[model samples]
Target chain A: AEYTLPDLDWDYGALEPHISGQINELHHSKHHATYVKGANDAVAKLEEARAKEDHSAILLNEKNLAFNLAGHVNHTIWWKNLSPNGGDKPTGELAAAIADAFGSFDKFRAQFHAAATTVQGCGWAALGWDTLGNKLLIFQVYDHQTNFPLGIVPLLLLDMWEHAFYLQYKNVKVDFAKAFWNVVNWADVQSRYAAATS
Target chain B: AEYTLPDLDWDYGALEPHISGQINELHHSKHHATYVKGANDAVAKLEEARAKEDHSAILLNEKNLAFNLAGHVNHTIWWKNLSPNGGDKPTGELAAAIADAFGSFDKFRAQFHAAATTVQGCGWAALGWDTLGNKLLIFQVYDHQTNFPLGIVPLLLLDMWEHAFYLQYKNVKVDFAKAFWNVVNWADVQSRYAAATS
Candidate 1:
């Protein structure tokens, strides 16, 4: 099955003030769409290599697979992780988990904010469910796939990629991260946590 | 209290033909040493922040903490991961793990080589022990700290940073990755795997 770009539930203008409609449109329609295409192309190339009994390009295709596939997954989650009515904080089990892992919601937010702002380059700051440790952890992701282990499931994700906010926030990443708090879909995050733990 | 630069096991010119002596000298004495200093400075800054009860710079220090500390750790392992008399393949448990995780040594090497060569920017290709999965996996690390989960232990690492090879190989990264095989210290990798698994 080919990966497809996910449709956003809210209108592009829904996140105005905090996130401009123009940025959202380009992010979903162009940037994320490209990853979907890249992933499909990578898959097709791998299949072609297999059919030809030639593994020479296998490495290149595999690299693309990791990069584009990860890009697709991260952005897909990120779109849903935001909402017009989003913001505030997580509740129930997810909230409890955040407290247990990071001391409190305020502490977790501060750390997450710091992570999102300080990314040295294009990447993300994620709240991941560490299955092995059975805890929630913050991860600094580089260019989608780098520096990430395979076992953790992403819960809350903040895209730090330049294209994500450069048009709207420019180089003041700190403001972007701060404004993001006003649009977080904690319900979606909570549900993901429920599914992961279950 | 402070991270220090590690001494290389072999002379700068030891891995000639594959890696130039000039690259080695600059890589160790300059690039690696800077990370060491950066990590120490970050630590000092954090201590100073706490003492003054001023947390404004905590985020910056933490970012540096992850980047410089991960750099220190990666380079420390990388120096040992290469040897003048290195190259060949693994034996015993390490070999068995590679086969189990990746199907065969040849397959693993091909993937690792591709990953090392295809890094979009400064990063690394590593063989890490996934503690959660109790298996081996290949990781693409960006800039030192991004894109990695905390639970895995690095067994073998290939530095893909431009400074690691740009002076000698220029833009021909494939050749750099290929040459790296001729200097891989499998014993060091195996010992790391043993320590991680045990």
Candidate 2:
């Protein structure tokens, strides 16, 4: 099972001007890093609970374990999912896979963006590759992390949390969403697609 | 009844850093005032419908009147209830009323603060003075208006909108809640309290 992301390899200010240096710094070094730490700590406690056979503690902590782990995994993907100079139509096997799964690219974009845009309150929009079934599914995650089945691995993610955009967009979720198109790195997404399905 | 706020008598950016000039401009001139104008417009339409004895329009817009009017009236009271350095302890009859209703000043404050904090979502905590029975009651207001009964005027108002404090306090709603104690003009509150209960 996944635990957390390692320390980031790139500079915090690598993506700036297009995205504020301050925004990128806080988004990656601090916010994503915190998720990493939180997820690891949650798993350690979960292991302890499992060892002690404290079923109640396992149940009590399972939610946090899964939620934060999802958060850590999702944010890690989010950091590389975008770039100022990144984004274009998906290609290769990934494009064909998306077309088959979502009916068409337009339908996929509509469904995916709808999930990203319609999340009420703080949450995330995740597109994960289902390796076992070779399918693509979209998810609207609530409050850091929640409401996903086990054994799934995320491939692409977008943070819908207010901290992710409120400072820039100020309650207008749509404006921030329009900007999101500028940042998606399909190269990274393709790599993830390869890992999950190859 | 209310349709929307009036689009006049107030300018946006009327209040600055205390609320951010931008937010004040948007909240009053755009959001709150729109409700006022909407409420008035709805009231006129409703009267016209009543005169014609045509219940058609009434069914279509009755909910709009209650919601918009409530928001308009609530924001109107909220505007006056605030002052740059206005909050002070209640005195004379209002103080005594507070004592009688909630045991003591501290207890009243506790109840008010608790109501404000425990709101399931964005809402208002109001200490309404009932003139008919000479009692104080608290209400949880949702959206622009449309929870509490009409004919009962507002005595105390606080804005829980994210714009009210998000820039300064991030996701911490209570920080703004606490600072509200400092900015509230108890002198104004006392006056409204007197009018509401008298």
Candidate 3:
């Protein structure tokens, strides 16, 4: 619960063919592990400050704590939201929302995927819920966390991390986007939406 | 010339068959006339400051002068370039250059026409020369004069001013863009390109 790496019991090659074994190993062991270590360090330092009752010192590390913790929490959720058995189509509320928000499910996917593919150079595709507006919106997130507007729950996030695809996809991001939907976890999306709503 | 009203040589009804008389009248008499007078007035005031040896005053009026003059010059050429007998395929160096730059003349026209039609709002779609790059670039210029980088020169300008077409096309900008090509003056474009190159 505090100052620790999240559980990584799942195998690196578990989500393969759809995600390829090589990418899974690198993405988790290398990428997510760094975020885990960084986040724990921030929390540990915070604990030290609190123990010393040094309120002023805590303020100095607030930015890094927030940035690393955000990356940690975001990536923590990012892992469970994809599966080898997922993708193909949406059913239930996810299906209905896709129709209502984007005219049709196909168009929603087309536009959302286009937004993903056309992102300038390096960015992530984000489908999110505007709790205030009662609609879903898409974003092209640059970096681990930049250019995203706040107060929305992100429902779908596809990492455009170059390390995630540099070997297999080469420089062809469009093909990577096409390959992404094959591993999308719709059930995870429904559960996340349920948690957010309730 | 302090200010200039448009030279109204023909009545609105004169170009009725090609474009609505009412639209032509309003577009020329009111719209183009406004720009002409506004630009000239701006220039005259600047010159007056120069005469009085108040060079600092030039800075005060320079922004408006460039803006209004660009509008005046752009719109003036736009009107004169259009004719019922205007468009019918280029047949010289202009045609040859179009092909050389964009692979084919059809491709160049497609790209330029696409820029014109896709302008978000009131703007100009220009076929322009990138002097530094030595290539043709399609630019969607918002407002009269804004957001263009230096080292670019307008070669062919198509005004998407609603006043240019609202009386006739009434929100049908695509059709207007199509009709616009028929009236584009390659002779004028050829002369401009020759000047730019030399």
Candidate 4:
């Protein structure tokens, strides 16, 4: 069976003032759905290529699979990471861990913003929990699949994909970014941090 | 409205002694076709995004547009750059220019071969004429778009993408490199050079 596009945790128009209803509808229904379908179709065919020993064909599909798969997975995380009632700083252990990892809460915000703001291509800026280091880390991904360190679990996703903010903010990503702070789902992030560390 | 895949100048099996007919059919009909379709779809969406002044989704479509448009152009050139009676070496100005640019034709071949063989991921190796320097150059293009020099005209394209060689060559890209010599369309190379130099 094909991997389906996951339903958003909230309504299409839920994220307001920061992310518009127009952006959310297009991002989720159109763009995100495309990645889910691309990934599913690629996965379905790869086995046949493998079974037939078509290594070269498999290699081509393999790269496609990686790009599409990563897009779907990251978008899934992003949906859960945002909410109408979200935003602001974390509390409890999550807050303490962020301070330890990035020197201060303010520093973490700055680093995370920089990572998200300066992404060179189609990618994401994310806060992940590094299993090996036992700490929270920031990542700037490329083309959905690259520039990510291995064995890290993504806890929060700040999608820098132009589609994520372009409708409301145009090329001025930093403005869209500033508004995003208001919708940062600390509750969901705290839960993710707890699971990753535990 | 769309970037369509161009027709191959030669029959699919014409370069068979080097690239298999099966590979040509799949590469042209299936692989290259996909890139064209992707570029077209991305373009259509970007137009809508522009009309509405919504750019948030543009990053995703733009990356798609670049990768696919390059693939379409690259494959279009690649088809005409091979022939049944191709190979041997260029004569006249093209040969002399190759020697002048890279010290000698042999030196140029060595670099091109190595570039093609050792590409880090899905990419191509090419012989280009740097418009600014007025000298020949070799390139290892990543995923059709990355690692290319701007303001250069491609004189020769040696595809290193897995789909270009995997069917006939398996995991051994060097063998594909060696076999490529047998189908080198020196006439097309010479024509491209003449235009670039003029």
lDDT of 2 by residue, A38-110 (tens): 6788778877877887777665477666666666767777777877667667889889988999988779888
lDDT of 2 by residue, B33-87 (tens): 6567767877888788888988876664786677667677777777777666555
- Place model 2 in a CAPRI quality band: incorrect
Q: Candidate 1 lDDT, tens digit per residue, B36-153?
A: 8986786566546544555566456656755776777788888999999889989998898888666678777877776677767788898876543365656667677755444457
Error of 4 at B45 (Å): 38
Name the 10 consecutive residues with the lowest summed lDDT in model 1 chain A. Answer: A130-139
User: TM-score for the first chain of model 3?
Assistant: 0.85
Candidate 1 local Cα displacement, residue A40, angstroms: 18
DockQ of predicted model 1: 0.09
lDDT of each: 0.77, 0.70, 0.71, 0.82
Ranked candidates, highest TM-score first: 2, 1, 4, 3
Q: Where is the poorest 10-residue window by lDDT in model 4 chain B?
A: B163-172
Winning model by lDDT: 4
- Record all residue pairs in model 1 with backbone atoms less than 3 Å apart, i.e. clashing: A146-B147, A147-B147, A147-B148, A148-B147, A148-B148
DockQ of each: 0.09, 0.11, 0.01, 0.03
In candidate 4, position A194 carries an lDDT of 90
| Alpha carbon RMSD to native, model 4 | 15.6
| TM-score for chain A in each prediction | 0.98, 0.82, 0.85, 0.95
| Model 3 alpha-carbon drift over 4 Å, by segment | A7-10, A47-60, B1-198
lDDT of 1 at A87: 88
Q: Per-residue lDDT for A30-143 in model 3, tens only? A: 657766777777778888888988878666467557656766666676677777678788889878877888989888888878877654334578888888877778887754
Highest TM-score against the true fold, candidate: 2
